[PDB]
């Protein structure tokens, strides 16, 4: 019987047309993204899309193997293999688009890098489907069989390049976030030490304590600036400045408070507002981290309230220092 | 389950499986 024996071949032709459209669709998105109009969906951290990309990417690796294995054999099995791969790349493209958009319109250079990485996969799939067609029901020795295997590696090479780009993107997207977190743990360790019953390394004068307190002023303002700019470089600088400023203020506070010439109520008062200041400040940094994950106007206005809470303790801290003489 | 650190390992080996110039 003349059962249709070019359906596999036919599926390859239809697949090639589909892949052409996806690439054209990714070029369009690169255009929008380059112009800065591919906006973030409020929050929707990159960490979410990363899983969907990776999951779909592993499915695409299986579809690659199925294509290679099924080029020799049934037309129907080849037709099925072609169709499956096109469905997967459609989905992979779409989830990568969402991941790139989740980086936000203020980082357009990285958005385009990400979309191109998946575009490269799309191109490699087109070549792979073309190679299976040329190899459709050919046996091992045939150069088309050689070419099919070679086409499939140039596909998986692209897939791993996509995965490498995703890893590089996410590290850069959180380098400041992860630095600020390191600072909050250091501050907590410092504050646990500050609050511990062990004495400070030495005593000091109100003037040493006072000069550290003023450091809080410059750091709070800086932190507020990083939360408003959301620039990872400002976040890095805030992390470094905040760690030193709070650590220093806690050291001098306890050293000044334990000075023999300080009355027990004034020592008590100084220690209390030292803790208060650090705690208010940790809540400010924690609000900064929330702002970095969903940088809308609402969260940023709330930075004002946190800055006031730190400032309120600073006033107490300065009056406590003066009362040590 | 596998994360990107291990996937990129299995896939670099898979690139060599497919690679028809590479046959030890």
Author numbering:
A (entry chain A): 1967 to 2291
B (entry chain C): 692 to 715
How does the study describe this entry?
Structurally, talin contains an N-terminal FERM domain (F0-F3) linked to 13 helical bundles (rod region, R1-R13) terminating in a dimerization domain (DD). The FERM domain binds and activates integrins, while the rod region contains vinculin-binding sites and actin-binding sites that couple integrins to the actomyosin machinery. Tensin3 consists of an N-terminal PTEN homology domain, a large intrinsically disordered region (IDR), and C-terminal SH2 and PTB domains. An exception is a talin-binding site (TBS) in the IDR, which is critical for FB formation and FN fibrillogenesis.
We first determined the structure of the talin–R11R12 in complex with tensin3 TBS to 2.76 Å resolution. This revealed that the tensin3 TBS forms an amphipathic α-helix that binds between the α2-α5 helices of the R11 bundle, forming a 6-helix bundle. Residues D696, S698, and D710 on tensin3 TBS establish electrostatic contacts with K2024, K2119, and K2133 on R11, while K2031 orients its sidechain away from L705 on tensin3. The hydrophobic surface of R11 engages with the uncharged face of TBS, with tensin3 residues L702 and I706 forming the core of the hydrophobic interface, demonstrating that these sites are critical for tensin3 interaction with talin R11. The R11-TBS structure demonstrated that the positively charged residues K2024 and K2031 on talin are involved in R11 binding to tensin3 TBS. However, the double mutation (K2024E+K2031E), referred to hereafter as the “R11m” mutant, completely abolished the recruitment. We therefore modeled the complexes using AlphaFold3 and low-quality electron density, which supports the general location and orientation of the helix on R7R8. This approach is justified by comparing the predicted structure and our experimental structure of the R11R12–tensin3 TBS complex, which are almost identical. Determining the structure of the tensin3 TBS in complex with talin R11R12 enabled us to design a point mutation (L702E) in tensin3 that completely disrupted its interaction with talin. Thus, L702 is critical for tensin3 interactions with all binding sites in talin, and these interactions share a similar mechanism. Talin R7R8 is characterized with the lowest Kd (15.8 ± 0.9 μM), with an enthalpy of 42.72 ± 2.06 kJ/mol. These endothermic binding profiles are similar to our previous observation regarding talin R11 with tensin3 TBS (17 μM).
